[PDB]
């Protein structure tokens, strides 16, 4: 069954930016609870503030989220020092978003989780940036798994993100995401492949439609977890329909339950 990382608590979204500035606890609790109620397995928290305010902002977001829901945190920062300084504010282990072959991300994050039950998203990039092909992404995923192994981190705890690019930039963006996913899972059947949805549609109209269909496909290609907006009813219906279509919803009960509970459908 697809693992859902709810994306909505970010500093990039203007309403969330404004709620952080205001210390608007109600808005953050409501995003937390409703993402959980829609089926999120992790609640992403991303401060998106300046460097010097990031750690305090993450701490505030984690405190408020955990008041509202027991669903575990996905700590989203591009600064491993920030992640280090907030890990202890989590009440239970969750997901770290993320590491990569860039700079010292692995050597800061992996000692911090080596021994505990934290999981980790690992992006397929390194110091030269986004890879320019499938093969490069696959080799980077291998290098990530080996590094993780040297700190005793099992492949099961790892969500490889092959950083899908925009379909407007490369019309093979999905055919290349599906190929990297097949090769990575072929080399590591216990590993998890993850993606965000939004990058795929950057540069196109009706981005929600494009995101949905990419999800519908990415699931069929083997994607195990995804960062997405589970408050998007249409997206949630497509998600659950795709779960039933891939033979993961016994007697289509979850889909039927979601409609009867008015989780999906009009409206």
Ligand X SMILES: Nc1nc2c(c(=O)[nH]1)N[C@@H](CNc1ccc(C(=O)N[C@@H](CCC(=O)O)C(=O)O)cc1)CN2
Q: Which residue ranges are tagged as binding site for (6S)-5,6,7,8-tetrahydrofolate? A: 7-8, 76, 97, 161, 232
**Considering the rule CB under 8 A, would residue 13 count as an interface residue with a second copy?**
no
**Considering the rule CB under 6 A, would residue 147 count as an interface residue with ligand X?**
no
Select from ligand X, a second copy, none the partner in contact with residue 167, using the beta carbon and a kind-dependent cut-off of 5 to 8 Å: a second copy
**Considering the rule CB under 6 A, would residue 242 count as an interface residue with ligand X?**
no
The least distance separating a second copy from the CB of residue 256, rounded to whole angstroms, comes to 6
Select the residue interacting with a second copy from 136, 147, 241, 254 (CB under 8 A).
241
Select the residue interacting with a second copy from 45, 209, 222, 254 (CB under 8 A).
209
SS3 letters across the chain: CCEEEEEEEECCCHHHHHHHHHCCHHHHHHHHHHHHHCCCCEEEEECCCCHHHHHHHHHHHHHHHHHHCCCCEEEECCCHHHHHHHHHHCCCCCEEEEEEECCCHHHHHHHHHECECCEEEEEEEECCECCCCHHHHHHHHHHHHHHHHCCCCCHHHEEEECCCCCCCCCCCHHHHHHHHHHHHHHHCCCCEEEEECHHHHCCCCCHHHHHHHHHHHHHHCCCCEEEECCCCHHHHHHHHHHHHHCCCCHHHHHHHHHHHCCCCCCC
Select from a second copy, ligand X, none the partner in contact with residue 9, using the beta carbon and a kind-dependent cut-off of 5 to 8 Å: none
Select the residue interacting with a second copy from 136, 143, 244, 254 (CB under 8 A).
244
Q: Which of residues 52-81 bind ligand X (CB under 6 A)?
A: 76
Nearest residue to ligand X on Cβ basis: 196
Q: Which residues bind a second copy (CB under 8 A)?
A: 167-168, 171-172, 174-175, 200, 203-206, 209-210, 212-214, 216-217, 220-221, 237-238, 241-242, 244-247, 249-252, 255-256, 259-260, 264-265
């Amino acid at each position: 069954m697809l693992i859902i990382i709810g994306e909505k608590i970010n500093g990039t979204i203007p309403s969330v930016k404004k709620a952080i500035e205001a210390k608007d606890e109600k808005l953050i609790r409501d995003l937390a609870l409703r993402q959980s109620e829609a089926g999120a397995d992790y609640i992403d928290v991303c401060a998106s503030t300046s460097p010097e305010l990031e750690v305090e902002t993450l701490q505030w977001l984690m405190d408020i989220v955990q008041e509202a829901t027991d669903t575990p945190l996905c700590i989203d920062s591009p600064n491993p020092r920030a992640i280090q300084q907030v890990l202890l504010y989590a009440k239970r282990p969750g997901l770290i978003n993320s590491v990569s072959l860039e700079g010292d991300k692995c050597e800061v994050i992996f000692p911090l989780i080596q021994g505990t039950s934290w999981q980790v998203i690992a992006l397929t990039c390194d110091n030269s940036g986004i890879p320019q092909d499938v093969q490069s992404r696959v080799e980077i995923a291998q290098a990530l798994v080996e590094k993780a192994q040297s700190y005793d981190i099992a492949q099961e705890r790892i969500h490889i993100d092959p950083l899908v690019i925009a379909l407007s930039a490369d019309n093979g963006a999905l055919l290349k995401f599906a190929e990297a996913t097949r090769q990575i899972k072929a080399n590591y059947p216990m590993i998890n492949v993850t993606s965000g949805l939004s990058n795929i549609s950057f540069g196109m109209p009706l981005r929600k439609v494009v995101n949905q269909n990419f999800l519908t496909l990415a699931m069929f290609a083997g994607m195990d977890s995804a960062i997405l907006d589970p408050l998007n009813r249409d997206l949630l219906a497509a998600l659950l329909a795709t779960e039933a279509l891939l033979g993961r919803d016994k007697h289509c009960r979850n889909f039927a339950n979601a409609y009867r509970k008015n989780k999906i459908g009009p409206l």
